[PDB]
Design a protein around this ligand. Structure first.
Ligand SMILES: CCCCCCCC(=O)SCCNC(=O)CCNC(=O)[C@H](O)C(C)(C)COP(=O)(O)OP(=O)(O)OC[C@H]1O[C@@H](n2cnc3c(N)ncnc32)[C@H](O)[C@@H]1OP(=O)(O)O
Ligand SMILES: N[C@@H]1[C@@H](O)[C@H](O)[C@@H](CO)O[C@H]1O
Length: 323
């Protein structure tokens, strides 16, 4: 098989040829790709908290080297492209393009198969770094969340956040209770930890937040002592001071943001970039006209109002010192 044949077979944009050539050069992994099957696949998916509806469909559609040779060629090389960067937070998060849905369920669940095929590799890395099993597993369960999110957002099974799953799969991101932390470095190479909030796990309670923060240094200093971060950095819609206009005092976002020191400049009022991000995280926004979107929470009402009024939301960046 060749990258042009693969590209055309799967119906990928000409845009992706460079990626495909790169993968082509890279070749198959030393350890040949293996997909768990049947009840082994069910157990793994269940452990990764993939909802049952999706897990059944994932197993049923599992591709095959002989019947799906283009898709299988990509599966091995995409797996290879991730594992070669195991432990390496300096490499860009390149998970590969999404596959056109005309390839059916195997195409839609492509990056789930990448994730399943890569679990053994990253779990070995976890073991080597002395990471507790429950931490490793808890970290990998975001696969379920992102699978469920695809369904809510689009109407059928899939997982199109493969750029993000490169972090879990390279063992450079760990969920430590309510928050996640990623190995990171600034433009000047100073190590920090990136701080992230997964959807699942309920509201962002001060006490859960605070516990996660207490876990970060001891965890990273024990298992990645070479890193030495003192500070956590976040970029998020939820760091927009403009939220103070709409959210009240019981809002966990309003209380927690107060600890943060913002480091980017106040954005231009007319800049529109942070719009799609807040829309994504609040509504899983999929192009629909704003009046259809639910209005059941103060935040839901807030983000519409603000946009209706011809105003814009921005992503802000800030830091907190790790306790
Ligand atoms: C504060 C630290 C900043 C650190 C930077 C983090 C960097 C990133 O990870 S960027 C991505 C962030 N992740 C997400 O957005 C995940 C999806 N979002 C969520 O699950 C939630 O927003 C979550 C859990 C994080 C916060 O929820 P919660 O603790 O309820 O927020 P809170 O400020 O207390 O809520 C205020 C109101 O808005 C509602 N609300 C909050 N978030 C959402 C949401 N995503 N969708 C709908 N309604 C929401 C609440 O239900 C509450 O409603 P009401 O006043 O009507 O009772
Ligand atoms: N889509 C990702 C989220 O899944 C993640 O929680 C956040 C962390 O800042 O980064 C966003 O771009």
């Amino acid at each position: 098989m060749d990258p042009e044949t693969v590209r055309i077979a799967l119906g990928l944009e000409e845009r992706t040829a460079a990626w495909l050539t790169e993968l082509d050069e890279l070749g198959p992994p030393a350890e040949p790709v293996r997909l768990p099957r049947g009840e082994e696949a069910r157990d793994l998916l269940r452990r990764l908290e993939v909802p049952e509806l999706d897990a059944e469909e994932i197993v049923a559609a599992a591709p095959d080297p002989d019947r799906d040779p283009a898709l299988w060629w990509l599966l091995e090389r995409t797996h290879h492209a991730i594992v070669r960067h195991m432990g390496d937070h300096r490499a860009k998060p390149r998970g590969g393009p999404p596959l056109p849905y005309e390839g059916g369920a195997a195409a839609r669940y492509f990056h789930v198969y990448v994730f399943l095929a890569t679990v053994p590799a990253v779990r070995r890395f976890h073991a080597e770094r002395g990471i507790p099993d429950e931490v490793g597993w808890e970290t990998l369960t975001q696969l379920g969340e992102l699978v469920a999110i695809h369904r809510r957002k689009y109407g059928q099974g899939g997982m199109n956040m493969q750029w993000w799953t490169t972090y879990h799969l390279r063992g450079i991101l760990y969920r430590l209770g309510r928050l996640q932390f990623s190995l990171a470095t600034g433009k000047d190479g100073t190590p920090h930890l990136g701080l992230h909030v997964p959807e699942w796990g309920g509201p962002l309670l001060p006490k859960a937040y605070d516990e996660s923060l207490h876990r970060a240094r001891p965890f990273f200093d024990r298992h990645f002592p070479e890193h030495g971060a003192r500070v956590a950095w976040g970029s998020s819609w939820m760091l927009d001071p403009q939220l103070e206009e709409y959210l009240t005092e019981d809002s966990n976002i309003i209380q927690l943001a107060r600890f943060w020191t913002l480091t980017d400049s106040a954005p231009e009022p007319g800049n529109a970039d942070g719009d799609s991000s807040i829309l994504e995280f609040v509504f899983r926004y999929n192009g629909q006209p704003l009046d259809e979107l639910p209005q059941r929470s103060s935040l839901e009402r807030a983000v519409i109002a603000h946009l209706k009024a011809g105003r814009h939301w921005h992503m802000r960046t800030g830091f907190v010192k790790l306790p």
